[model samples]
Target: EVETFAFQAEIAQLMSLIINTFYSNKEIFLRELISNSSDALDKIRYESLTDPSKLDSGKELHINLIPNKQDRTLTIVDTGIGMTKADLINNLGTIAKSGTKAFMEALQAGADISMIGQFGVGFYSAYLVAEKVTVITKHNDDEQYAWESSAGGSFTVRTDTGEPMGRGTKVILHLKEDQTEYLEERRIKEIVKKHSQFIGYPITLFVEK
Candidate 1:
């Protein structure tokens, strides 16, 4: 049986502040997400190079983009180390790995970590755009599952439709009307390059044009 958990009051306050003020430009949300994807790709590629089995259920390393004009939905999928149910809960739920306390400590200490890149909630940045966000992730260790949220309050995680990426994760962002620019293939690809060009993995733009 699976149980859920909640954040302490301080953690909630931290997440709220992050959503409100941490980021200066809305456009960098895309860049931040891509940077995280790139980091994931790099992590997996290094593992696979050392052990062939690491890439067995997934590709070597790649990022795919699917933009649907009809619904203004943009999907970004990557063949990397997928997270399990607990990982999703801990990562996407209450707080991120670099928790509210540590984030504050770093800043107060002048630790020199870039707030945007180092805060470790890179995935949540997607909520900056979509009305609803869904993540279908198949971890190497377990069955695939879906993590869905609206950013209004809480998020839900459940067993997936059983269709795996075979392994890896696919993020679907239901873009807002004003954020429709994110659905443009060229625009997103450029954003990826601008932030992740030197990311050391193959990034493919799959525009069903």
Candidate 2:
């Protein structure tokens, strides 16, 4: 059974800034997503320090960008600390600190608006460019599950019986009408090297030869 939940009030306001006010800066959405992937990778690596078994023995820590022009989709896959159903609900559905006042102050001042930095709201930034977003993830302690939303206040989550992800997350973004630029191979590579070149893990683009 799928379960649905609404965004918190602060999160709703943040989404408003993303879809409406931040259109010109939507490219930063890629940076935010990649930053979150880096964080997840760091987490699993840190966990494995104490218990090597914390990681999936089969997969190395890395990030993969798969852009499909035919499908109009950009997928960001990370071999990192994957989320459980509860983790998805909590992580994606609510802003951690509800920095409503600070967020508004920054937005009003036209300050840096990459959101994940100011508000720890990186995942929701996908809405800045995608019409729909789907996340399929598996964690060491949980079965695979899918969380999906259209940047609307609510989102749905259900167990996914498909092939397992081993232990990681895959985020598929359905680009909006004018956001097809993100599906271009060279463009995505430029964005990754531009914003995330300094990241520890390898960020590779999968493109046809």
Which candidate leads in TM-score?
Answer: 2
Candidate 1, which segments miss by more than 4 Å at Cα? Answer: 1-11, 18-24, 92-97, 102-114
Each prediction's RMSD to truth: 3.5, 1.9
Tell me the lDDT of candidate 2.
0.81
Q: After superposing candidate 2, which stretches have Cα over 4 Å from the reference?
A: 93-97
Q: What TM-score would every model get versus the actual structure?
A: 0.81, 0.92
lDDT of 1 by residue, 113-167 (tens): 2354566655656756777888888767788888876665566788886565777
lDDT of each: 0.70, 0.81
**Top candidate (lDDT):** 2
Give the backbone clash total of model 1: 0
In candidate 1, how many Å is residue 35 off? 2.2
The residue-level lDDT of candidate 2 at 195 comes to 77
